[PDB]
């Protein structure tokens, strides 16, 4: 009808012995694959950054920097530690209608260079999910590309459901 079924959590590995204070900091969104498709309006999706800030209570203050309409956009929220280290939930979700509970899981990371992070939504029977490719820089090697594509496909996503955003020199640096 619109989307690919969200794969079981078994299909989604977790970074063994996840290290809080080393995943902290800025990650560029250099790749994105999701079951929800796009508008393809204009055609290129701009690159954006996400700053993970570790707090005392082990939650992350998550600030995302984007650029659109001659404006720098800032999206601030909290990632609450989930059942296993490397897993997060989205809390404080109330008020504005749409009880969307998010599931966050760190699959793999260098801490120093790359990370791949799984995202799952639960809201009204049909579930939206995406995998995000993070890098400490904006560079994208064919090796990292191919790695990500194959990981996407193993979760049931087609080639055309995978996006590699064009790098920008505005807001995100």
């Amino acid at each position: 009808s619109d989307l690919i079924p969200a794969p079981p959590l078994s299909k989604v590995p977790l970074q063994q012995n996840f290290q809080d204070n080393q995943f902290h900091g800025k990650w560029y969104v250099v790749g994105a694959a999701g079951n929800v498709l796009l508008r393809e309006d204009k055609d290129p999706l701009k690159m954006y950054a996400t700053i993970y800030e570790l707090k005392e209570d082990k939650s992350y203050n998550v600030t995302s920097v984007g650029f659109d309409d001659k404006k720098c956009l800032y999206k601030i929220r909290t990632f609450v530690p989930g059942s296993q280290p490397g897993e997060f939930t989205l809390g404080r979700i109330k008020s504005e209608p749409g009880g969307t509970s998010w599931l966050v899981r760190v699959v793999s990371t260098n801490y120093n260079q790359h990370a791949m992070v799984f995202f799952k939504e639960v809201a009204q029977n049909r579930e939206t999910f995406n995998i995000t490719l993070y890098g400490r820089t904006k560079e994208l090697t064919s090796e990292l590309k191919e790695n990500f594509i194959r990981f996407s496909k193993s979760l049931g996503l087609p080639e055309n459901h995978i996006v590699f955003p064009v790098p920008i020199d505005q807001c995100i640096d």
């Binding site: 995302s64 929220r77 995000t132």
Partner: peptide
């Protein structure tokens, strides 16, 4: 969308 990945849509 500008924040097309991660916890999409929120707020």
């Amino acid at each position: 969308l500008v924040f097309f990945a991660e916890d999409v849509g929120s707020n």
